[PDB]
Amino acid sequence: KFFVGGNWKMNGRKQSLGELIGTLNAAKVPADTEVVCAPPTAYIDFARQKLDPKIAVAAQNCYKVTNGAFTGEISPGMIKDCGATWVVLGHSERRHVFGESDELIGQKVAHALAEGLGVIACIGEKLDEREAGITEKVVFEQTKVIADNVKDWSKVVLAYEPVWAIGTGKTATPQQAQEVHEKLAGWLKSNVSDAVAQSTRIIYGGSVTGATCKELASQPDVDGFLVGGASLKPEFVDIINAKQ
Amino acid sequence: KFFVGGNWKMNGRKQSLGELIGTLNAAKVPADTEVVCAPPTAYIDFARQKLDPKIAVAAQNCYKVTNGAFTGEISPGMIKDCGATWVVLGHSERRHVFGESDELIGQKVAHALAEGLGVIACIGEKLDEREAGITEKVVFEQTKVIADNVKDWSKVVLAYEPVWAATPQQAQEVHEKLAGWLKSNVSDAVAQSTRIIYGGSVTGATCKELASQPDVDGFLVGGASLKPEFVDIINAKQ
Lengths: 244, 238
Ligand SMILES: [Br-]
Ligand code: NA
Ligand code: NA
Ligand code: NA
Ligand code: NA
What we know:
Helix content of chain A: 40-55%
CATH class of chain A: Alpha Beta
Shape of chain A: globular
CATH topology of chain A: TIM Barrel
Chains A, B: Triosephosphate isomerase
Distance between the termini of chain A: 13 Å
Structural class of chain A: alpha/beta
Strand content of chain A: 15-25%
CATH architecture of chain A: Alpha-Beta Barrel
Number of domains of chain A: 1
Assembly: dimeric
Largest interface: A-B, 42 and 43 residues
Bound molecules: bromide ion, sodium ion
CATH superfamily of chain A: Aldolase class I
Strand order of the largest sheet of chain A: 7-6-5-4-3-2-1-8
Oligomer: homodimer
Keywords: isomerase
Number of helices of chain A: 11
Order of helices and strands of chain A: EHEHEHEHHEHHEHHEHEH
Organism of A, B: Homo sapiens
PDB class: isomerase
């Protein structure tokens, strides 16, 4: 199933997000497409209440124990208690703005999965890493740490973020995304199963719009999207329709 | 006003927090006491709906702009939109588990206050800082960073977290130094009106003798805030 995730990031209030959710509830979700929305943490509850059950909800981050002295964090069990079924982990903003290490992200992955959430596990290389020629190394290491903490890939989606194209002056073509997605899909096929490679969705977390979504979705190993800014707009419906 | 804050940290679910809120709604709060509860961030909305208006709600953290590409963060705008009126900033767990720098905490304070939220600004020295004798230096620089980003102390509460642990006298000793720092570096008026609450281990047994200290103006309660004895702590001055 084609996977379309909307990452609202740190945006919206009850009013604007209620309007957005109204637009999404009205949209026909294709039968072959699974749609997930990641609202700001203070609105997970609100969003799950207002969104139609056909759209799943995701938390944007979580910590690695079920309860503890971690002022300002939330646990997978709280996410589940609010009706959310996924959590985004390892987002480039968590890694580079807030310094989340690979080890911490892997431990969060293991805990989210053990508590029965699905996980959208994000990876990607920065500009200087790409230009130094070690896209391979960075992306494989980050995927290794995630895989070390994944026992059932049924509940996991891997999101490649071309961090090197975020505000840097360079952008990623569809072919470049397909290049990296194929190299990742070889890893999974190589280090897990052939069935897991056919099963596991590798989604693209770069810049995607209504105008570009169809060409990118046509790439053989692009199996979905983790959408940023467009996720707050009616244009997100076009990206839901990428495969139609 | 005697200030009693309860930091639930990363604990509770809708059902168990509903029971906790029921016990708090039923308890009668003394005249001259402001009670604030800080739920896990996924339950700010839920907590505000179930708590009687007499109890204010606080977020446990926020970021430093109103909206942006900061997956996993919330802004003071969203805190207000959820009916909360406070945010805890600089808590020892944020600084020492999640490595939040003083600069970032100062920026957070500046933005939260500009947006109309109250701030519970937390400070405190680790045990190695204490054992090296530099307790005063640590909390003085931490407070200085907050003070440089405060334009209205009306809205601010200072919370001293003895991360190192603590007897009531040691607490009052630190609180008195902080009050003196405010008097000398900000203004006499701010030093006299700003409430410095104690954020170390507070229990229904230790609450009254801590509250009686002249510069201990309240508490920011941890574990005990999830238990019935929080009511006793709310009554520490009776
Ligand atoms: Br606390
Ligand atoms: Na990783
Ligand atoms: Na292999
Ligand atoms: Na495809
Ligand atoms: Na007192």
